[PDB]
Amino acid sequence: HGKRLFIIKPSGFYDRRFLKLMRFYILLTGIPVAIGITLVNVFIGEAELADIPEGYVPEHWEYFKHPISR
Amino acid sequence: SGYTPDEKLRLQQLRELRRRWLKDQELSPREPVLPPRRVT
Numbered sequence: 241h242g243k244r245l246f247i248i249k250p251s252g253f254y255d256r257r258f259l260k261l262m263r264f265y266i267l268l269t270g271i272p273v274a275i276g277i278t279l280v281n282v283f284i285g286e287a288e289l290a291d292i293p294e295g296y297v298p299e300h301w302e303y304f305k306h307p308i309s310r
Numbered sequence: 311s312g313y314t315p316d317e318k319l320r321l322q323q324l325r326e327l328r329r330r331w332l333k334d335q336e337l338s339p340r341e342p343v344l345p346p347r348r349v350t
Contacts, residue, residue: 244337 280307 285307292298304310313321 244341246335246337246341 277308 287305287307287310289305301310
């Protein structure tokens with residue numbers, strides 16, 4: 241049937257534009273952050289606990305495990 | 311009872327206006343003119 245009718249509705253242009261802009265900027269920073277975190281975890285991370293050698297005083301950041309936290 | 315002549319005439323005019331509006335609500339064959347663009 242050729243009974244297609246016009247649907248009266250408010251403009252969704254501005255809502256879609258805001259949602260795309262917000263997603264774009266959030267991803268603009270989050271995708272590099274996620275990639276960097278994954279690379280650090282895979283290739284660098286996970287320090288292991290050890291006993292302090294005699295006569296050696298560690299740095300204040302040497303008491304932490306995660307490389308980003310250190 | 312029933313419609314007064316003024317009521318009948320006003321209803322007739324409103325009816326023809328409303329039917330024109332409703333007919334105008336229909337879409338032409340090209341009406342959703344869509345702009346295309348891509349980047350087991």
